[PDB]
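Tutorial sheet, problem 5. The three components below are modelled jointly, 1572 residues in total.
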Amino acid sequence: AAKDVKFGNDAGVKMLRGVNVLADAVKVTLGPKGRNVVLDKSFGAPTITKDGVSVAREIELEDKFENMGAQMVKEVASKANDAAGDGTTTATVLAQAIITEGLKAVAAGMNPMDLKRGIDKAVTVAVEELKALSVPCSDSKAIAQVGTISANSDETVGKLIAEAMDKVGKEGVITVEDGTGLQDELDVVEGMQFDRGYLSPYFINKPETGAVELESPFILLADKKISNIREMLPVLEAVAKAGKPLLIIAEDVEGEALATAVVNTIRGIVKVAAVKAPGFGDRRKAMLQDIATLTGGTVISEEIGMELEKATLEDLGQAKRVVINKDTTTIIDGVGEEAAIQGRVAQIRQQIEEATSDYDREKLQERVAKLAGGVAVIKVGAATEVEMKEKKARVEDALHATRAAVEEGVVAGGGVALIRVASKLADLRGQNEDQNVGIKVALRAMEAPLRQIVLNCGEEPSVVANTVKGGDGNYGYNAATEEYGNMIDMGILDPTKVTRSALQYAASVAGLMITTECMVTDLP
Amino acid sequence: AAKDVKFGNDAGVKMLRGVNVLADAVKVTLGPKGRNVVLDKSFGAPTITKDGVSVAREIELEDKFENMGAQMVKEVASKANDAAGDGTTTATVLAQAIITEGLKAVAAGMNPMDLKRGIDKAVTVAVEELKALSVPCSDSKAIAQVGTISANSDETVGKLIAEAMDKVGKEGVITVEDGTGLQDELDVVEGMQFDRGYLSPYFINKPETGAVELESPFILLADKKISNIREMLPVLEAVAKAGKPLLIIAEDVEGEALATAVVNTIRGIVKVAAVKAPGFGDRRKAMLQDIATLTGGTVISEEIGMELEKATLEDLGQAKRVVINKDTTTIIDGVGEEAAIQGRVAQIRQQIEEATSDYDREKLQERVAKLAGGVAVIKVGAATEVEMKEKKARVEDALHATRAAVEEGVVAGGGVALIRVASKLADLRGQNEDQNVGIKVALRAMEAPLRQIVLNCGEEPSVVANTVKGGDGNYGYNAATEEYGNMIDMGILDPTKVTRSALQYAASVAGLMITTECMVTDLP
Amino acid sequence: AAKDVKFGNDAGVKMLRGVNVLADAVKVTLGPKGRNVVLDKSFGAPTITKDGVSVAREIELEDKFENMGAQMVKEVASKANDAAGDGTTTATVLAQAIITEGLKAVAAGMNPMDLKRGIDKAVTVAVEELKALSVPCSDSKAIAQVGTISANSDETVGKLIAEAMDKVGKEGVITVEDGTGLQDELDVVEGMQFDRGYLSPYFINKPETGAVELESPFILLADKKISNIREMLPVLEAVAKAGKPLLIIAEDVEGEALATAVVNTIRGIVKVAAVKAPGFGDRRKAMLQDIATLTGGTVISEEIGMELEKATLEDLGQAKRVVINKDTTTIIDGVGEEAAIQGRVAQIRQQIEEATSDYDREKLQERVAKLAGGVAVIKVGAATEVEMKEKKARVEDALHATRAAVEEGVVAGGGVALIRVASKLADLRGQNEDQNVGIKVALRAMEAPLRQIVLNCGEEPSVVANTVKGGDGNYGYNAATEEYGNMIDMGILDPTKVTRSALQYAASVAGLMITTECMVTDLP
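Model answer (structure tokens):
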């Protein structure tokens, strides 16, 4: 359709306005003294929330250009939460900061490309600095401390996490489920998890968390690309007769007839979810085998002349439960044959011993790790179903926070780590002056989160920032108690991974936006 | 419907406005320091891009006249990319330049026809000059150097290209596919390629590249003109039963019932693509035979009393994969019979020996070349599916750049070749003064690309252009490092074919537009 | 009246707009290829001019704020012409340049006060550099060369100047008058000149040059402050009876009754001009004596009981002619008594010998210099009254240019001196980064005049500037011949004083304007 096109500063003011609406709405919720945000609902009474992610989700602007600015920052900042399990609001606050001052410099005549180089440099060094400031979290004592901190100081949740991680490894697969009573339960089970999410977002099940749970599903393993439902109908019918849901693990499901029907048609009659087989090339085939033996099912491969038209229920595998999300599939309890699973693990173990290269060995043992590793299932018990459900949420949150913590450590929370590394980089320079202001732009932006936090406290942000900067190490301001001190000792910290992801993604969009000369959108 | 008609300068200002919007939007992305362009999407978050071809694709204007101007330049400039595999944005920048100054002269009272003759002359001589400035790229060392340069200095990609080209000829057919693992693979296979594109653009498949891939398709060869689906339904049903896609190679498919249903109806149920048989007259029939034997299928000819109503699956040929685009069809792995294929090649080889004219011999051997030539398939391997997919793109790009390079050599990139040849033509003259300004208009326009590139660098374009022009040979400005030097040594070059196609097509529309006196369009 | 008040950037854009109208109108006339400007007149046919001072005089804007911006730059830039006899347009061009980029930086968030400090520093050093680049003009050969150059290469005018200056000193008082015939005449005459201009601009006589000529006027010396006409009427009557004009040299004339009547009433009946007595304190009295003896008149001092009520014609002095302007009064031919004048000069000469301090000696000899110096009168002869009048103008212009040249030398004209000193100051820095951009702002602005000059030539200003900067010494671009070379040898130069005044005044307003936060004006 006829388009509306904007160039330079015109497009600049437009994006800045859309970003400021998004950022200003979301940032009010930042910190222990964060304010509420009311989100209207046609469904009934408005929702009062402090979850900056929920607010962002509702932000859409009327002006096509301004809306483009907001949707850009929203997309990138969301990648932070996906990556580190948190960081979206901080990413938005930083983004707004870098974009605001970056565009000012651009409008002052500075070179966009240089400004971006400077911003990029400061971020590189700053990430190094965060890495240095990081406090590791490896021992079970640490793991529990982080866990309870994330679970709002719940010693029990920390224990659970630490116990699960100890019983399955810090990088092992751990799930959280509803308890059967008062007592918590933990049991490692034959299972597996691979980095492959649902093909269609429309597969989301009851779990509001943006996931899909399937009780006793039938796993269908086919290394073919299923684009049409025709050669799969018989299976679907049989599955339907069983009343059990279905999980389709194929090379890829094309939205021509299969994914089309599986979604558009199966909106209640059946529970079917589809995901891509892990890996590519030959490994894709091997892994499907691992999954097959694990679930006790067989893979349908055209190479062997296997026909989905003849795929009977016995070919389908099964698991106690399966949880799929944006980019992961976890097979919780494979109905596989213990000895068979052990046989494969041994078979692959042998292959590793006779490997002729590092690459082969690596991938080979990654597979045995999955099969031989198992899944640790946490069953959150409580006195009442309400408590149980609430605690379960806490466990899920703490689990993510802790995993991120074991991976890259922990750093002073409250927006102090960012303002810390920034104070160090005061002598950093670049190939030229534009690059230098670029560097300054990033450094000043690193103070935005703390200043926002102190703003919601009704305190003076430039005074607290000035004070925190003058200090050293993990010395900061505790907005909860509104007293200065050692952030780590005060138990106010964030996984270094979320602070890093937040900064990097924020700098990413800020950079793109600062080096954008033209915007194209449909006319109203 | 009632039309709106414009004449002379009125139509002139209209087209100029439509061209300036299109060119200004697209040219911001030119050069190593090219800026970003945001393209709104209703599908979700906007797309931030630097691909001038993507931007152009989105340009549609509200004013009917201005939009005509833009659509004209877009259509011709796109032919450059199709021809040389690149050149569209440069073609647009040049076009804008020639059109801007041409119309000024026209409005000054100069003769449009003369102005165009002058422009046309300058381009003829300039193309000769580019030919002279060209550095050949024939030896495998050169082929690899160009290949890696195109693959962002990836020695491996250059190797691949050179290896493939050596194993199948520099003008042989080479395809790129996904790897089966870490290692790259290369294997010549039974295949063929002819200059015939898809009948309907609506046949475009998953490949966003404006192409269509078909895995294990059934090739239908019919030298009849299929306008109605009736006499083809039985075949379609059988194909459907096989679940395999279909490729229809017929004399021509008419949009009455066949192309209508094949597109409008087959939007998911089946995968059907249609293309015209190669050549015309008797050759059309002969070639279809070649394709038939190659794919192992048989041609349905009304001459022999063949009825499509009775066309069974055994009549249909098959290939491992088929890729069709705007103006080409490539049969990657014909399931033909080795001996049969060899028999035909021999049969035609004999025919060549007993040929009674140059024309006969020529076309005869063009056919044996296709059959006896084979297709070189490159399998891009990598450590991860992401890497593999990214590298594969690089290989595809480098492959096109290199093929263009072997054909017409290579020339100083960065908009330097055009400004070079232009500095030489300073004494060129024509039949008269109007023709002379015509010549000047084109020569000055040849500086547009470099000046744009330098503009995006934040540098002074008239100073760099002045300096580059004063130099000689492949001496230019390296916008990457922002230093002058020998473009070829600095590894900054373009295939002479793209620079040529860009200039010629740009001058084409510029000429038409400059000699346009009336525009007709529907009223709003 | 109710006011309209603006602050910060709002007032910024307003002043910038008013300055751009003023500067853009005036700068079109810059250089040998300067364009014309048409200034409407109700009096008859429009005036076509290239005199940037005339254009500026006509610039008044509708918007009260924008007009304030224009009137500010006009007032300061005019001080340059007053000081060095030229420089107004250059001052305007520079001012526009410094203001344009200064305000950009301010709007970018830079500190106004710092920016101004930087600008001020660059100007200080640059003036030093100009002083160093200066070519002295002292010997009569030089004086003549500069003179003819100013007189459009007229060897005769140069001769005249050099002859006059030699016959009366380089810092002596020289006047230009109409010739009595074909031959030029030059004669030193009993006269004097002091730095005191007319009290009311409404005293301007026939000389359109903004001056007042009085033939055989009666000089009235009164050290009293004349605010009322009452005690002066008798004198005025007597003067009227003589029909001769009158020059009133008093301590000060107050606009209550005297200056009121002398102007508002004497608009044709009499020719009366008034100026303040030179110096202050006791010196004011002494000097009046010198003037008295010089003109042969007597001073009326209340101290001695002198009453203006009784001031007869014999008390009034007389001179062949008197010329008064904005800030100077020149008594051309005092009817004093040779011996009396010689007596005073001797009397003061004695006082100098018995002086007890440097200050006394200095001022004492400044007085004898005036009396004993005399005035050199140049009589411009020609073949026709038209030629005579035209040549006379040339002599007056050349005389001013040359005097400025003897005082501070001469520098490469054509906007080359400014771009020269600027290229040297590339390493200059200040107390901080804002101060640094301030410095850069000034340096870049120093290129504006040459770039404008080359712009009017239809040439590329950034190319010529780049070339001139790369050169060294007085190497520049001759816009007249449009060839590079040694500006001084090519005879293209400006008195160092005008280039200096232009830069300083330009930086003055630019600084004030850049550090202005609020503007107040009446509402429309």
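Marking note: Chain C touches chain A through eight residues (CB under 8 Å). Full credit if you identified this.
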